[PDB]
Amino acid sequence: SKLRPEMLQDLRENTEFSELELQEWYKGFLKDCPTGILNVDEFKKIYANFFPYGDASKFAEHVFRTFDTNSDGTIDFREFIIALSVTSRGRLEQKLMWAFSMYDLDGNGYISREEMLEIVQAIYKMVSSVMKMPEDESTPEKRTEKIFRQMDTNNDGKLSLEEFIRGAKSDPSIVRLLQCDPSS
Ligand SMILES: [Ca+2]
Ligand SMILES: [Ca+2]
Ligand SMILES: [Ca+2]
């Protein structure tokens, strides 16, 4: 019912959750996923709460690939909570590291254009029914077109991690966030 003391400490180190929150998350996790393992179909049902199932499905699949760090087809409680912790309470630097690890489809250390386009397409499909887009990045190809041509510094047609991180920071939602840096 409850995390072992040895387990608990490993997760306090690798997440930004308190012990109480970890115990509460674990209980609730087993509550909702009795096997102790989340598979892809389950993960799609989670996303389907927030956006329509069919639409959200391909994005969900990519997220799952990334959460599933050992890459076996399921997510244990550890992979879940660590992924949750990073994405929801991580440093900005390490959020983008994780986002990069998602876009780099074949895990070679570079995002190719066709890797980018693919993710961007999935985000657009999930969202299509409910958010209405800017004007110039209001099509996956157009967007992928903006991103590369703002982020590919050395022009090899690939994004390195450092290119990725630097460029993301001129996203408006980051430009906003950064105005809240408590270093004033
Ligand atoms: Ca796994
Ligand atoms: Ca790649
Ligand atoms: Ca490059």
Residue numbers in the entry: 6 to 189
Task: Please quote the paper that reports this structure.
Mutations at positions T71N and A190T were shown to be critical in development of DYT2 dystonia. The crystal structure of hippocalcin(T71N) and hippocalcin(A190T) did not show any significant conformation difference when compared to the wild-type protein and they have identical crystal packing. Mutation A190T is located at the end of the flexible C-terminal helix, which is predicted to interact with hippocalcin target protein. Change from Ala to Thr does not decrease C-terminus flexibility.This part has no electron density in chain A. As expected, hippocalcin(A190T) presented similar calcium-binding properties to the wild-type protein with Kd = 77 ± 5 nM and n = 1.3 ± 0.1. Oligomerisation upon calcium binding was also observed for the disease-causing mutants hippocalcin(T71N) and hippocalcin(A190T). However, the mutations significantly decreased the oligomer formation when compared to the wild-type protein. Hippocalcin(A190T) showed increased binding to both channels compared to the wild-type protein, suggesting that the mutation in the C-terminus region is important for target interaction, as previously shown for other NCS proteins. For the dystonia-causing mutants hippocalcin(T71N) and hippocalcin(A190T), calcium influx upon stimulation significantly increased to 51% and 62%, respectively, compared to hippocalcin wild-type. For both hippocalcin and hippocalcin(A190T), fluorescence calcium signal decreased by ∼60% in the presence of ω-conotoxin MVIIC and ∼50% in the presence of ω-conotoxin GVIA. These results suggest that the increased calcium response due to hippocalcin(A190T) expression was predominantly due to calcium entry through N-type calcium channels.
